[PDB]
Every structure is written in structure tokens, then in C-alpha cells.
Amino acid sequence: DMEEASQRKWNFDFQNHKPLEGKYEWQEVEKGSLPEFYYRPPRPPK
Amino acid sequence: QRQDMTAFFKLFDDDLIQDFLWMDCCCKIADKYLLAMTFVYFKRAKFTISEHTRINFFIALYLANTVEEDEEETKYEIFPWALGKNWRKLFPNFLKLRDQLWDRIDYRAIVSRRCCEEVMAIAPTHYIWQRERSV
């Protein structure tokens, strides 16, 4: 399906959440440097 | 955009479906639009004739509902009809089926009004498309 393809493109197996391969440079940064949206969880439906 | 469509109308001669629409009063869960959207999803997923059935219908209707309806409760009422008596813990693997259907259509649930009206432009004589709500 598409997760092996997404793996192909995004240079990652989604896997451990932090491996890498090449052709993209993947980091792991501190949450504090991100503009609040990217580590923002979903919202309660209530 | 395709002229066959006949395998899709076959579902509405079914019993559980007919009684499901009879259950629907103000067309809250199944609108003439939502029943068009449930077809658009059938096209997008490229279902075979073997692939249109009870579960694959309700599963699309639930998706159209969660997308186009801000009322988050009424759409639950589909569960007893689809899954039989105990859906109670049997609804989640239904939800994952919805997510899989969403995976199949390449994530575009959104269907424009004009596109909705264009798929009912085929055989307007059909009863489904005379069901509409107001206020």
C-alpha cells in the first residue's frame, strides 16, 4: 500500500518515530522551539 | 462521470436499508446529499460490484456524516443497523474500517455541492433525491 511509498519518500519507516535513511535530513528538536502547532495534540470533542 | 451507477441503487431495494431510511425522519443521518456523497466515495474508492454492500454503505455514510455534519451524536445511530445487536464494543473496528475507506479514496472526503447535484442529475425520478430537510 502507501505506507511503504510514504516510507520511500520521507526517508523513514515511521517505525520507532526516530530513525532515518538519507535524501532527507531528519533531526529531533526540542518542543520549545516549535511554533506550538506541530506538537499540538488533537482537541476534545465533548 | 460514469453511466452505470445501477449497482449503487440496488442497495436501496434492500430491507435493512429501506427500514433504515424509514427510521430517518428529518433526514438527519441520511440526506439526499449524504446519500450522494456515499456514492461519490464509492467512485473514489473504485469499488467493484462485489464491493457494494451493507457495511461498505454505512461505513461511507458515517464518513460523510462526520465530515459534513457538526452534530456529533445522531450519526452514532448507524451502529445498531450495521453491526447488529452488540455494536457496543463492536463499533471501534467499524471506525477503523471507516479509516481504511478514507485511506482508499486518498483522503479526500470533501465533495462539492455542484458535484453532489450532478450525480443526482442522472435519474432524478429516484425517490432518494426527494428527501430533504429544512430549518
Binding site: 510514504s6 535524501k23 511554533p35 470533542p45 | 465530515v67 456529533e72 486518498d106 483522503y107 429544512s134
Partner: protein, 270 residues
Amino acid sequence: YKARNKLTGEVVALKKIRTEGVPSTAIREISLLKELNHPNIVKLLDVIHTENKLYLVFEFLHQDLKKFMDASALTGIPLPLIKSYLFQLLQGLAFCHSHRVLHRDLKPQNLLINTEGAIKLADFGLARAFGVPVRTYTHEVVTLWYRAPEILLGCKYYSTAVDIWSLGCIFAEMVTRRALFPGDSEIDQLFRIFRTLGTPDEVVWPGVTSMPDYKPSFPKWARQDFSKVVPPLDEDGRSLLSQMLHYDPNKRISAKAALAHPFFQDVTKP
């Protein structure tokens, strides 16, 4: 997470999700973001499905608007920069409104910016498609201080006019450096709107008394001048803001009508 691209020189981000069913807000966020490709809107590159966990893929902007507004209380923001940001927001919002989209959340943390002088919309989680007629709508919609009056009172089948208001509440924020209507709660925040913008009436609004939450026990306030409440703005700025925020949703200026406003004569891209 985060990312970097050695080729094409771009940067993206992950934002995972992850237990009995996929959230109804995420479906809307993703399904809408896949139908919207705009330079002034944050994009959605790819979406996966793996068992317990779901990751998204987002174009990574460097910061949001709050932390940039929190970046300077001391100094301000250059008026051309504000004009650029607002023109941009109005453009992307014109792309949203005009085709099958209502955001129904606008706040600076949902507005991302970069170093190249661009600003884009984010968080369509509460957004939906208004194209299909006779739908259902929750009237708890945007977040807190940025709420439109008509939705603050009872209103059914609210149109695109609810986003514009928020932008107004954003507009003033980029000017006075502070929040416009720092409401402590519902009502409250409404009476703050009544304090700054004045108490409504049937001269201003056709159906104001016919709104369900409305009761004529409301204290009567006059309309404060836009020199006092937002001094740094020029006459063009006040001219835009005035018709940008008004109690009548039927009057309230659309996005396409905003882009041509005389305030934008000086628009630039710093």
C-alpha cells in the same frame, strides 16, 4: 521529528496523532487541507496510517504570530510589515472562503510565519465545508477572545462573516500589541465588545433583538473612537477595521472587498 531537505532546500514537520477510532476533527483538518493548495496557507504533503499511530506531514514555518507578537511589546511592528501580513491573511482567507471552506478558528497561534516575510493559516481542525446547503453547525466555534458577536449570541446558519471578525480581532492585536477583547468568559467578552465598539441596536442590526440569548437588560455603551482604542492606525487602517468589525454580518466586508481597500495602497513584501 522536524526534518531537512538537502535538495530543493525546504523544511517540514511531523505532528503525530495516535486507540479506538480516528478523531473527527483530524478527518476534517486533513480532508480539507488536501483540497486546499495555496501559497498563503500551510500545506499538507502526506498522511499515513500505521496501526496505533498516525503521522501527518506539514510545511515547517519558523514561528507563530503570538511569540512574534510576544517578541516585541517593547518595540512595535513596522506598519508595512503589518500591511503585508494582513494582506496575505486576507488573500489566503479569500482562497478559503470563496471555495467550500470556513475555518471557524482564527488566533495568532494558528497563524504561522517565516523569515522570508510570509504568513500562513494553520489548524483547520475546527474547519468545515459550507458548500453543501442545510447543514448542522455547533455555535461554539472559534477560541475565546476572537469570537464574532452573532455567534456569541444565538445565530443559526452563520456565514463566512465569522472569520473576518476574528481577523479584525487579530488586526488590532498586531497594532496595540495586546489583545483587543480580553474576555474573562462568555457574556463578559461580549460586554467588552460593547465597551469598545458600543452597544448594538436595530439601527445597526436588523435582527439583533430577535437573537435568542439577547435580553434588553444590557447596559448601553456608546461607540469609543478608534483613535483612543487603536492609536497607531492611520485613517485608512481605521477605515478598514471599522467595516471589518461591525455587528451586522450582512454588512461585514468580505475578503475580496478587503484586498482592494485604500489601506493596501502601500502593501509590500518585506
